Coordinates of C-alpha atoms and ligand atoms in Angstrom, one line a residue:
Chain L
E1 CA 10.3 -43.8 -25.5
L2 CA 8.8 -41.9 -22.5
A3 CA 12.1 -40.0 -22.0
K4 CA 11.4 -37.7 -25.0
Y5 CA 10.5 -34.8 -22.7
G6 CA 12.8 -35.9 -19.8
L7 CA 11.9 -37.4 -16.5
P8 CA 9.9 -35.6 -13.8
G9 CA 12.3 -36.1 -10.9
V10 CA 15.5 -37.8 -10.1
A11 CA 17.9 -38.1 -7.1
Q12 CA 19.4 -34.8 -6.1
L13 CA 22.9 -35.4 -4.6
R14 CA 24.9 -32.4 -3.5
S15 CA 28.6 -32.6 -2.8
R16 CA 30.0 -29.9 -0.5
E17 CA 33.4 -29.4 1.0
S18 CA 32.4 -31.0 4.3
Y19 CA 29.7 -33.6 3.4
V20 CA 27.6 -35.1 0.6
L21 CA 23.8 -35.2 0.9
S22 CA 20.8 -36.5 -0.9
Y23 CA 18.0 -33.9 -1.0
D24 CA 14.2 -34.6 -0.9
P25 CA 12.3 -31.8 -2.6
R26 CA 8.9 -33.1 -1.3
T27 CA 9.9 -32.6 2.4
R28 CA 12.3 -29.7 1.5
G29 CA 15.1 -31.3 3.5
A30 CA 17.9 -33.8 3.2
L31 CA 17.2 -37.5 3.2
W32 CA 20.7 -38.2 4.6
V33 CA 24.0 -36.4 5.0
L34 CA 27.3 -38.2 5.0
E35 CA 30.6 -37.0 6.6
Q36 CA 34.0 -38.4 7.4
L37 CA 35.4 -37.1 10.7
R38 CA 39.0 -37.2 11.6
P39 CA 41.1 -35.4 14.2
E40 CA 42.9 -32.9 11.9
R41 CA 39.3 -32.0 10.7
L42 CA 38.2 -31.0 14.2
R43 CA 40.8 -28.4 15.0
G44 CA 40.3 -24.9 13.9
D45 CA 41.2 -22.1 11.5
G46 CA 37.6 -22.6 10.5
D47 CA 36.1 -22.1 13.8
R48 CA 34.8 -18.6 13.2
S49 CA 31.0 -18.9 13.1
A50 CA 30.9 -15.7 11.2
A51 CA 28.8 -17.9 8.9
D52 CA 25.0 -17.3 8.7
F53 CA 22.4 -19.7 7.5
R54 CA 21.7 -19.4 3.7
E55 CA 19.1 -20.9 1.4
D56 CA 20.5 -23.3 -1.1
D57 CA 20.3 -21.7 -4.6
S58 CA 21.1 -25.1 -6.3
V59 CA 17.6 -26.3 -5.2
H60 CA 14.7 -25.1 -7.3
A61 CA 12.8 -22.3 -5.6
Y62 CA 9.6 -24.4 -5.4
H63 CA 11.4 -26.9 -3.2
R64 CA 13.9 -24.7 -1.3
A65 CA 13.8 -24.0 2.5
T66 CA 14.5 -20.3 3.3
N67 CA 15.3 -18.5 6.6
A68 CA 11.7 -17.1 6.5
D69 CA 10.3 -20.6 6.7
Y70 CA 12.1 -20.9 10.1
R71 CA 11.4 -17.5 11.5
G72 CA 8.7 -17.6 14.2
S73 CA 8.3 -21.3 13.9
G74 CA 9.6 -22.2 17.3
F75 CA 12.1 -24.5 15.7
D76 CA 15.9 -24.1 15.5
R77 CA 17.9 -24.5 12.3
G78 CA 19.5 -27.8 13.2
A79 CA 22.5 -28.6 11.0
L80 CA 22.8 -32.3 10.2
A81 CA 26.5 -32.1 9.2
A82 CA 27.6 -30.2 12.3
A83 CA 29.5 -26.9 12.0
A84 CA 32.0 -28.0 14.7
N85 CA 32.9 -31.1 12.7
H86 CA 34.5 -28.9 10.1
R87 CA 36.8 -26.3 11.7
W88 CA 39.5 -27.5 9.3
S89 CA 38.6 -24.9 6.7
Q90 CA 36.3 -21.9 6.5
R91 CA 34.7 -23.2 3.3
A92 CA 34.0 -26.5 5.0
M93 CA 32.3 -24.8 7.9
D94 CA 30.4 -22.3 5.7
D95 CA 28.9 -25.2 3.7
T96 CA 27.3 -26.6 6.8
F97 CA 25.1 -23.4 6.9
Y98 CA 23.3 -24.2 3.7
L99 CA 19.7 -24.8 4.7
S100 CA 19.7 -28.0 2.6
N101 CA 21.9 -29.3 5.5
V102 CA 19.4 -28.1 8.1
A103 CA 16.1 -29.4 9.5
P104 CA 13.6 -27.9 12.0
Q105 CA 14.8 -29.1 15.4
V106 CA 13.2 -28.6 18.8
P107 CA 15.6 -26.1 20.5
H108 CA 16.1 -28.2 23.6
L109 CA 17.2 -31.1 21.5
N110 CA 19.5 -29.1 19.3
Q111 CA 21.2 -27.5 22.3
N112 CA 21.5 -30.5 24.6
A113 CA 21.0 -34.2 23.8
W114 CA 21.7 -33.9 20.0
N115 CA 24.7 -31.7 20.7
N116 CA 26.0 -34.3 23.2
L117 CA 25.7 -37.0 20.6
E118 CA 27.7 -34.8 18.1
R119 CA 30.4 -34.2 20.7
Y120 CA 30.6 -38.0 21.4
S121 CA 30.9 -38.7 17.7
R122 CA 33.9 -36.3 17.5
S123 CA 35.5 -37.8 20.5
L124 CA 35.7 -41.2 18.8
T125 CA 38.2 -39.9 16.2
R126 CA 40.7 -40.3 19.1
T127 CA 40.1 -44.0 19.1
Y128 CA 39.3 -45.2 15.6
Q129 CA 41.3 -45.0 12.3
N130 CA 38.2 -43.5 10.6
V131 CA 34.8 -42.2 11.8
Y132 CA 32.1 -41.9 9.2
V133 CA 28.7 -40.3 10.2
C134 CA 25.4 -40.5 8.4
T135 CA 22.7 -38.3 9.8
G136 CA 19.1 -37.6 8.7
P137 CA 15.5 -37.3 9.5
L138 CA 12.8 -39.8 10.2
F139 CA 9.0 -39.6 9.9
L140 CA 7.8 -42.4 12.1
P141 CA 4.2 -43.6 12.3
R142 CA 2.1 -43.8 15.4
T143 CA -1.0 -45.8 16.3
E144 CA -3.8 -43.4 17.1
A145 CA -7.0 -44.0 19.1
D146 CA -8.9 -45.4 16.2
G147 CA -6.5 -48.3 15.9
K148 CA -5.0 -47.1 12.7
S149 CA -1.4 -46.0 12.1
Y150 CA -0.5 -42.5 10.7
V151 CA 2.5 -40.5 9.9
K152 CA 1.9 -36.9 11.1
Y153 CA 4.5 -34.1 10.9
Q154 CA 4.2 -30.3 11.0
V155 CA 5.2 -28.3 8.0
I156 CA 6.5 -24.8 8.6
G157 CA 6.6 -21.7 6.4
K158 CA 5.1 -20.8 3.1
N159 CA 7.4 -23.5 1.6
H160 CA 6.0 -26.2 3.9
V161 CA 9.3 -27.4 5.2
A162 CA 8.8 -30.7 7.0
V163 CA 9.5 -31.1 10.7
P164 CA 11.0 -34.6 11.3
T165 CA 9.4 -36.7 14.0
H166 CA 12.8 -38.2 14.9
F167 CA 16.5 -38.0 13.8
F168 CA 18.9 -40.9 13.1
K169 CA 22.7 -41.0 13.3
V170 CA 24.7 -43.9 12.0
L171 CA 28.4 -44.2 13.0
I172 CA 30.7 -46.3 10.9
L173 CA 33.9 -47.0 13.0
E174 CA 37.1 -48.3 11.4
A175 CA 39.7 -49.9 13.7
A176 CA 42.9 -51.7 13.0
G177 CA 43.1 -55.0 11.2
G178 CA 40.1 -54.2 9.0
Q179 CA 37.6 -54.1 11.8
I180 CA 34.4 -52.2 10.9
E181 CA 31.5 -51.5 13.3
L182 CA 28.2 -49.7 12.9
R183 CA 26.6 -47.9 15.9
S184 CA 23.3 -46.2 15.3
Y185 CA 21.1 -43.9 17.3
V186 CA 17.5 -42.4 17.1
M187 CA 16.2 -39.5 19.1
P188 CA 12.7 -38.0 19.0
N189 CA 12.4 -34.4 17.7
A190 CA 11.5 -33.3 21.2
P191 CA 13.1 -32.1 24.5
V192 CA 15.3 -35.0 25.5
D193 CA 16.5 -35.3 29.1
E194 CA 20.2 -34.5 28.8
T195 CA 21.1 -36.7 31.7
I196 CA 19.9 -39.8 29.9
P197 CA 23.0 -41.8 28.8
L198 CA 23.5 -41.7 25.1
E199 CA 23.6 -45.5 24.7
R200 CA 19.9 -45.6 25.6
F201 CA 19.2 -44.3 22.1
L202 CA 21.0 -47.1 20.4
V203 CA 18.8 -49.0 17.9
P204 CA 19.5 -51.9 15.6
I205 CA 20.5 -50.6 12.1
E206 CA 17.7 -52.7 10.5
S207 CA 15.0 -50.6 12.3
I208 CA 16.5 -47.4 10.8
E209 CA 16.9 -49.0 7.4
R210 CA 13.2 -50.2 7.4
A211 CA 11.9 -46.8 8.6
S212 CA 14.1 -44.5 6.5
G213 CA 14.0 -46.4 3.2
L214 CA 17.8 -46.5 3.2
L215 CA 20.2 -49.4 3.1
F216 CA 23.5 -49.3 5.1
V217 CA 24.8 -52.8 5.8
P218 CA 24.9 -54.2 2.2
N219 CA 27.1 -51.3 1.0
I220 CA 29.5 -51.7 4.0
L221 CA 29.5 -55.5 3.8
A222 CA 30.4 -55.2 0.1
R223 CA 33.3 -53.2 1.6
Chain R
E1 CA 36.5 -40.2 -0.7
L2 CA 33.6 -39.5 1.6
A3 CA 31.5 -42.1 -0.3
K4 CA 33.8 -44.9 0.8
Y5 CA 31.0 -47.3 1.9
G6 CA 28.7 -46.4 -0.9
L7 CA 25.7 -44.1 -0.6
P8 CA 22.8 -45.2 1.6
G9 CA 20.1 -44.2 -0.9
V10 CA 19.9 -43.5 -4.7
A11 CA 17.1 -42.8 -7.2
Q12 CA 15.2 -46.0 -7.9
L13 CA 13.9 -46.0 -11.5
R14 CA 12.2 -49.1 -12.8
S15 CA 11.5 -49.6 -16.4
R16 CA 8.7 -51.9 -17.3
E17 CA 7.1 -52.8 -20.6
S18 CA 4.2 -50.4 -20.1
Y19 CA 5.7 -47.6 -18.0
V20 CA 8.7 -46.1 -16.2
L21 CA 8.4 -45.2 -12.6
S22 CA 10.5 -43.8 -9.7
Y23 CA 10.1 -45.6 -6.4
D24 CA 10.1 -44.1 -2.9
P25 CA 11.2 -46.7 -0.4
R26 CA 10.2 -44.6 2.6
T27 CA 6.5 -44.5 1.6
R28 CA 6.7 -47.9 -0.1
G29 CA 5.1 -46.4 -3.2
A30 CA 5.8 -44.8 -6.5
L31 CA 6.7 -41.1 -6.6
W32 CA 5.6 -40.9 -10.2
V33 CA 4.7 -43.2 -13.1
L34 CA 5.1 -42.3 -16.8
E35 CA 3.3 -43.9 -19.7
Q36 CA 2.3 -43.4 -23.3
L37 CA -1.3 -44.0 -24.3
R38 CA -1.4 -45.6 -27.9
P39 CA -4.7 -46.0 -29.9
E40 CA -3.5 -49.5 -30.7
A41 CA -3.3 -61.0 -13.8
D42 CA -3.2 -60.8 -10.0
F43 CA -1.2 -58.3 -8.0
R44 CA 2.4 -59.3 -7.3
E45 CA 4.9 -57.8 -4.9
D46 CA 7.9 -56.3 -6.7
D47 CA 11.0 -58.5 -6.1
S48 CA 13.2 -55.7 -7.5
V49 CA 12.5 -53.8 -4.3
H50 CA 14.3 -54.6 -1.1
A51 CA 12.0 -56.6 1.2
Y52 CA 12.4 -53.9 3.9
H53 CA 10.7 -51.4 1.5
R54 CA 8.4 -53.5 -0.5
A55 CA 4.6 -53.4 -0.4
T56 CA 2.8 -56.8 -0.2
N57 CA -0.7 -58.1 -0.8
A58 CA -1.0 -58.7 2.9
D59 CA -0.4 -55.0 3.5
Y60 CA -3.6 -54.3 1.6
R61 CA -5.8 -57.1 2.9
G62 CA -8.4 -55.9 5.4
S63 CA -7.2 -52.3 5.1
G64 CA -10.3 -51.1 3.4
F65 CA -8.3 -49.7 0.5
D66 CA -8.2 -51.0 -3.1
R67 CA -5.0 -51.7 -4.9
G68 CA -5.2 -48.8 -7.2
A69 CA -2.9 -49.1 -10.2
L70 CA -1.2 -45.8 -11.2
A71 CA -0.5 -46.9 -14.8
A72 CA -3.9 -48.5 -15.5
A73 CA -4.2 -52.0 -16.8
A74 CA -6.7 -50.8 -19.5
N75 CA -4.0 -48.5 -21.0
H76 CA -1.9 -51.5 -22.0
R77 CA -4.2 -54.0 -23.8
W78 CA -1.7 -54.0 -26.7
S79 CA 0.4 -56.7 -25.0
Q80 CA -0.1 -59.4 -22.3
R81 CA 3.3 -58.5 -20.9
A82 CA 2.5 -54.8 -20.8
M83 CA -0.7 -55.4 -18.9
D84 CA 0.9 -57.9 -16.5
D85 CA 3.5 -55.3 -15.5
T86 CA 0.7 -53.0 -14.2
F87 CA 0.0 -55.5 -11.5
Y88 CA 3.3 -55.1 -9.7
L89 CA 2.5 -53.5 -6.3
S90 CA 5.3 -50.9 -7.0
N91 CA 2.7 -49.5 -9.6
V92 CA 0.0 -49.5 -6.9
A93 CA -1.2 -47.2 -4.2
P94 CA -3.9 -47.6 -1.5
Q95 CA -7.1 -46.0 -3.0
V96 CA -10.5 -45.5 -1.5
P97 CA -12.6 -48.1 -3.3
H98 CA -15.2 -45.6 -4.5
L99 CA -12.5 -43.4 -6.0
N100 CA -10.8 -46.4 -7.7
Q101 CA -14.0 -47.6 -9.3
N102 CA -15.7 -44.4 -10.3
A103 CA -14.2 -41.0 -10.7
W104 CA -10.6 -42.0 -11.1
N105 CA -11.6 -44.7 -13.5
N106 CA -13.5 -42.1 -15.5
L107 CA -10.4 -39.9 -15.5
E108 CA -8.4 -42.8 -16.9
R109 CA -11.0 -43.5 -19.6
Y110 CA -11.1 -39.8 -20.5
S111 CA -7.3 -39.8 -20.9
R112 CA -7.5 -42.8 -23.3
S113 CA -10.1 -40.9 -25.4
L114 CA -7.7 -38.1 -26.1
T115 CA -5.7 -40.4 -28.3
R116 CA -8.5 -39.7 -30.8
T117 CA -7.5 -36.1 -30.9
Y118 CA -3.8 -35.7 -30.3
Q119 CA -0.8 -36.9 -32.2
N120 CA 0.7 -38.4 -29.0
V121 CA -0.6 -38.7 -25.4
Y122 CA 1.7 -39.3 -22.4
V123 CA 0.5 -39.5 -18.8
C124 CA 2.4 -38.9 -15.5
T125 CA 0.5 -40.2 -12.5
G126 CA 1.4 -40.2 -8.8
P127 CA 0.5 -39.6 -5.1
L128 CA 0.4 -36.4 -3.2
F129 CA 0.7 -35.9 0.6
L130 CA -0.9 -32.5 1.1
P131 CA -0.8 -30.5 4.4
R132 CA -3.9 -29.2 6.2
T133 CA -4.3 -26.6 8.9
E134 CA -5.6 -28.0 12.2
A135 CA -7.4 -26.4 15.1
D136 CA -4.1 -25.3 16.7
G137 CA -3.3 -23.0 13.7
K138 CA -0.4 -25.2 12.6
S139 CA -0.2 -27.1 9.3
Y140 CA 0.5 -30.8 9.2
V141 CA 1.0 -33.6 6.7
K142 CA -1.0 -36.6 8.0
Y143 CA -1.6 -39.8 6.2
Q144 CA -2.5 -43.4 7.1
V145 CA 0.1 -46.2 6.7
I146 CA -1.3 -49.7 6.2
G147 CA 0.1 -53.2 6.9
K148 CA 3.2 -54.5 8.6
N149 CA 5.3 -52.6 6.0
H150 CA 3.5 -49.3 6.6
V151 CA 2.5 -48.6 3.0
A152 CA 1.6 -44.9 2.8
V153 CA -2.0 -43.9 1.9
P154 CA -1.8 -40.8 -0.3
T155 CA -4.1 -37.9 0.6
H156 CA -4.6 -37.0 -3.1
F157 CA -3.5 -38.2 -6.5
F158 CA -2.3 -36.2 -9.5
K159 CA -2.5 -36.9 -13.2
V160 CA -0.6 -34.8 -15.7
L161 CA -1.6 -35.3 -19.4
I162 CA 1.1 -34.4 -21.9
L163 CA -0.7 -33.8 -25.1
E164 CA 1.2 -33.4 -28.4
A165 CA -0.8 -31.3 -30.9
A166 CA 0.1 -30.1 -34.4
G167 CA 3.4 -28.4 -34.9
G168 CA 4.9 -30.1 -31.9
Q169 CA 2.9 -27.9 -29.6
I170 CA 2.6 -29.5 -26.2
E171 CA -0.4 -29.0 -24.0
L172 CA -0.3 -29.8 -20.3
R173 CA -3.5 -30.8 -18.5
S174 CA -3.2 -31.4 -14.8
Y175 CA -5.7 -33.0 -12.5
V176 CA -5.8 -33.7 -8.7
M177 CA -8.4 -35.7 -6.8
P178 CA -8.6 -36.4 -3.1
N179 CA -8.2 -40.0 -2.0
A180 CA -11.8 -40.1 -1.0
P181 CA -15.3 -41.0 -2.4
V182 CA -15.4 -38.4 -5.2
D183 CA -18.8 -37.6 -6.7
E184 CA -18.6 -39.0 -10.2
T185 CA -21.2 -36.6 -11.6
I186 CA -18.8 -33.7 -11.1
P187 CA -17.3 -32.9 -14.5
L188 CA -13.6 -33.8 -14.7
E189 CA -12.7 -30.3 -15.7
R190 CA -13.5 -29.2 -12.1
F191 CA -10.4 -31.2 -10.9
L192 CA -8.0 -29.3 -13.2
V193 CA -5.3 -27.4 -11.2
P194 CA -2.4 -25.3 -12.4
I195 CA 0.6 -27.6 -13.0
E196 CA 2.8 -25.3 -10.9
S197 CA 0.8 -26.2 -7.8
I198 CA 1.4 -29.9 -8.4
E199 CA 5.1 -29.3 -9.0
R200 CA 5.4 -27.2 -5.9
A201 CA 3.7 -29.8 -3.7
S202 CA 5.1 -32.9 -5.2
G203 CA 8.8 -32.0 -5.5
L204 CA 8.6 -32.8 -9.2
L205 CA 9.4 -30.8 -12.3
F206 CA 7.5 -32.2 -15.3
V207 CA 8.7 -32.3 -18.9
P208 CA 12.1 -30.6 -18.1
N209 CA 13.2 -30.9 -21.7
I210 CA 10.6 -28.2 -22.5
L211 CA 12.8 -25.2 -21.5
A212 CA 10.1 -22.7 -22.4
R213 CA 6.5 -24.1 -22.1
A214 CA 3.6 -23.3 -24.4
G215 CA 2.1 -20.0 -23.3
Ligands
MG1 MG1 24.4 -29.5 14.4
MG2 MG1 -5.5 -52.6 -12.2

């Protein structure tokens, strides 16, 4: 019936203590990572980073990023579900150090503008009933001098781990009386001036949905 | 429950009369298409795909690429409905015209001829996006996207033949061709590659019910 020998590839969801992700074996990185932030989550007893980055043995070795892929690349191991979101448990924080939760990030971005966006996201748990965060890579085309449009991204290491051109982050913010808002950001995988205000990187959710292949607003509007 | 507001992206399988496929909404193209070759329309956009992520005829028009069907129309003469389903653009990738009409057409005809010889013939076809090293020493994936909807142009295509011989023995024959004007006098056997190289590059693991493959 064509399934006799099984199908050649299906969605790879991974549920960890601190997040759920969907994994793309072609790029060797997550398609998206989903977290729920709340205030009890952000205060410690996790907050030992005595965790090291670890390859994800639940991913077939053909399609698995390793620490050796990153070494000498010039890229940081940039965690999509952030370690500091998950001080509420050591297991929760350790799970953020799986390389399936990680993408090659320009070090300036990882340390400054993206870190600021992560801190801002946590600060909103003081305001909203619930804060959900969906984070992931983008591979965005550009028009080159021949007039044609191309996607171009570096791959690093023997395992050809894809370097995203950009990153997105979608915030779902729950306030009282059933209010639901969506705020969504894109930054380039590049040094980003840390003194640029974060709301300059707001984009409409439709542009992220079109570019990423994902759908956000139908699921949320369904409640 | 983390997944309160659903999940932003799932596997997208589509069953048709003539094939099963898995659809990648980021590239706006199939990840793989699976069909059975048995001895015994115009192109339409696929309304089962969200419009944000759906290739259209306008995406191909004036692009210089042919609408290359992954499951080939000539595989599914056994039914009007089966052949019609090959003209959904979800079954289609941008193909260099010369490739579509000559060497990849010959590969498709050759695959059909194996139904003479084997008890069953299944075929898994799809795109590849293969990196290359540039003058700066670094390796890049680079591919054209065409149309308003940015339909990805594969750098290569793969075809895996799953050949069922006597005794239930399964033989795997794996081919890759560049998305380029391939010299059609080159014997098809020159495009054979080890299936592991396709699995590594594509993210796919073929025939996973075969826990221990032939030899
Ligand atoms: Mg981080
Ligand atoms: Mg056709």
